[PDB]
Amino acid sequence: VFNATRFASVYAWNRKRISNCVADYSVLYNSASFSTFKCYGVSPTKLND
Amino acid sequence: QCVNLTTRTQLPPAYTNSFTRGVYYPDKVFRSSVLHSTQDLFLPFFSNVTWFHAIKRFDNPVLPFNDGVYFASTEKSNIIRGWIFGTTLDSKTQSLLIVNNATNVVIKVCEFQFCNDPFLGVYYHKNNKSWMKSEFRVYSSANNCTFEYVSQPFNLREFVFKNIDGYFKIYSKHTPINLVRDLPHGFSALEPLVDLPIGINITRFQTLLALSSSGWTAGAAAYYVGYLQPRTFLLKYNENGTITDAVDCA
Amino acid sequence: SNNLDSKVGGNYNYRYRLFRKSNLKPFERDISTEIYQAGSTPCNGVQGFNCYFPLQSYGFQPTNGVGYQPYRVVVLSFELLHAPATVCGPKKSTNLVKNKCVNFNFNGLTGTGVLTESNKKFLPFQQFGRDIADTTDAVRDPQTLE
Amino acid sequence: SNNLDSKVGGNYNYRYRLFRKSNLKPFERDISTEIYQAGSTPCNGVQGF
Ligand SMILES: *[C@@H]1O[C@H](CO)[C@@H](O[C@@H]2O[C@H](CO)[C@@H](O)[C@H](O)[C@H]2NC(C)=O)[C@H](O)[C@H]1NC(C)=O
Numbered sequence: 001v002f003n004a005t006r007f008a009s010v011y012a013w014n015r016k017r018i019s020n021c022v023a024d025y026s027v028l029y030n031s032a033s034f035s036t037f038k039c040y041g042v043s044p045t046k047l048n049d
Numbered sequence: 050q051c052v053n054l055t056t057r058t059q060l061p062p063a064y065t066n067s068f069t070r071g072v073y074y075p076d077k078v079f080r081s082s083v084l085h086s087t088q089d090l091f092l093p094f095f096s097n098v099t100w101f102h103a104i105k106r107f108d109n110p111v112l113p114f115n116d117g118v119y120f121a122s123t124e125k126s127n128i129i130r131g132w133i134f135g136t137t138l139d140s141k142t143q144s145l146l147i148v149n150n151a152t153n154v155v156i157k158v159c160e161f162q163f164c165n166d167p168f169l170g171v172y173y174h175k176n177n178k179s180w181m182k183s184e185f186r187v188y189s190s191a192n193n194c195t196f197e198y199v200s201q202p203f204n205l206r207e208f209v210f211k212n213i214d215g216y217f218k219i220y221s222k223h224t225p226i227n228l229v230r231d232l233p234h235g236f237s238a239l240e241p242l243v244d245l246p247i248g249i250n251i252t253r254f255q256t257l258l259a260l261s262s263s264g265w266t267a268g269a270a271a272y273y274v275g276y277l278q279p280r281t282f283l284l285k286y287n288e289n290g291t292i293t294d295a296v297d298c299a
Numbered sequence: 300s301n302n303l304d305s306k307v308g309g310n311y312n313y314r315y316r317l318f319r320k321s322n323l324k325p326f327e328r329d330i331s332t333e334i335y336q337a338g339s340t341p342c343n344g345v346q347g348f349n350c351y352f353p354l355q356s357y358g359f360q361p362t363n364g365v366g367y368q369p370y371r372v373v374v375l376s377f378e379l380l381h382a383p384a385t386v387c388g389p390k391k392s393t394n395l396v397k398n399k400c401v402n403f404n405f406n407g408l409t410g411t412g413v414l415t416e417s418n419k420k421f422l423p424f425q426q427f428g429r430d431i432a433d434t435t436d437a438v439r440d441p442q443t444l445e
Numbered sequence: 446s447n448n449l450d451s452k453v454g455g456n457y458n459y460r461y462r463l464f465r466k467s468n469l470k471p472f473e474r475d476i477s478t479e480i481y482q483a484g485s486t487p488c489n490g491v492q493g494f
Pocket residue numbers: 051052053055165
């Protein structure tokens with residue numbers, strides 16, 4: 001999803017579906033690679049809960 | 050592909066006596082040398098299970114799916130190969146596809162536009178003296194997908210299906226009786242194999258059977274359908290904690 | 300993503316929708332390349348007065364200002380809590396002590412006890428033992444199955 | 446109390462607490478203003494990311 005080869009163009013934006021698995025973000029929010037991560041109704045902490 | 054092989058006019062329904070079946074481990078709990086009672090959705094003892102054939106014959110109806118189903122087949126040549134469970138069966142909603150293909154078992158949930166007469170077809174021993182699959186004639190489209198599993202690739206066969214609380218629980222036993230004909234009374238239980246959290250409604254189901262677009266042979270097989278019901282069963286566990294005998298209290 | 304997605308002449312592979320007949324709706328996707336009508340005039344053919352092609356390409360360059368640089372977006376979207384739950388958060392585990400009194404949990408079987416290596420055998424699908432009183436008396440480790 | 450308190454440009458003179466380590470105890474008052482650390486980082490001084 002993030003470290004994918006190349007990204008899609010916004011006139012044509014990709015939708016990738018996800019299922020049947022576990023969402024550990026420990027290598028995601030705790031990484032300084034993103035200049036902006038905002039959640040709009042949950043704490044990024046609480047996501048692993 | 051998608052084709053109507055509508056030749057067999059509907060006939061009158063057949064029946065038999067499901068003496069001591071549809072006992073399955075109700076929950077994943079170890080218990081031993083102990084007689085645990087439980088109300089759950091069970092096939093009523095000695096009930097008139099509805100009986101079906103392929104032969105000349107290729108019976109495959111859109112049965113009800115109400116309060117869970119026991120399904121089984123007595124089999125050669127692995128004829129019964131999946132089931133279409135759903136609630137419109139024409140992509141106006143999702144529906145569940147279960148299939149056993151010659152490469153793998155696959156289970157999928159999408160807004161499937163099914164065939165009027167959905168099936169799978171294989172050339173019969175022809176020309177190369179190998180059999181091979183070719184006609185996948187079950188659905189025309191799949192647009193909005195939710196679940197998609199495929200197995201790592203590659204008689205009496207018993208199954209139970211419950212869509213309770215949006216979990217589709219499958220219980221099964223493959224017991225290779227060499228007894229040649231009667232539905233053989235005597236006792237055993239189904240283990241759960243898999244659970245799918247699909248959340249979809251189901252109201253009807255249909256079985257899938259293995260068959261130039263028309264005129265063919267249906268390989269001979271027999272299969273049986275009985276709906277489960279809320280009852281109370283007293284379950285004898287043995288030392289090992291297998292369900293070794295039962296009483297239907299009613 | 301200026302160190303990825305910019306190209307020294309401009310990365311015109313990346314594109315937006317500069318024109319439309321009305322402002323679009325939440326999560327809509329539009330692939331149209333049919334020419335836009337900016338006035339009251341019916342625009343016909345590949346060009347004309349008040350004819351515009353509704354797409355445009357970004358001039359993403361490694362020399363752009365902090366703003367005209369390119370920036371990746373992943374929206375982790377999900378609709379919620381109107382079905383069974385097929386994706387959840389991580390459930391961290393700790394080492395398995397024995398012969399001590401503990402507040403145990405196994406798969407959500409929270410409880411309290413002393414844990415000891417059973418000689419009971421279970422059939423593979425079973426996760427926990429009960430007893431004659433229909434109280435719980437045993438559990439399988441979901442990691443290192445015993 | 447709008448006709449007593451509410452200015453045209455708005456009373457900012459009344460405040461509430463949005464961040465706190467823990468939910469406070471009954472009849473407890475908090476005069477804290479020390480910077481809350483949402484990130485895993487420490488965050489000494491008046492401000493930070
Ligand atoms: C398979 O046969 C059925 C009928 O046996 C076809 O359904 C008909 O479809 C037409 C339009 O093509 C409707 O006007 C009729 O009312 C339908 N009749 C019935 C009884 O279904 C169906 O189209 C056929 N499928 C294919 C792929 O040919």
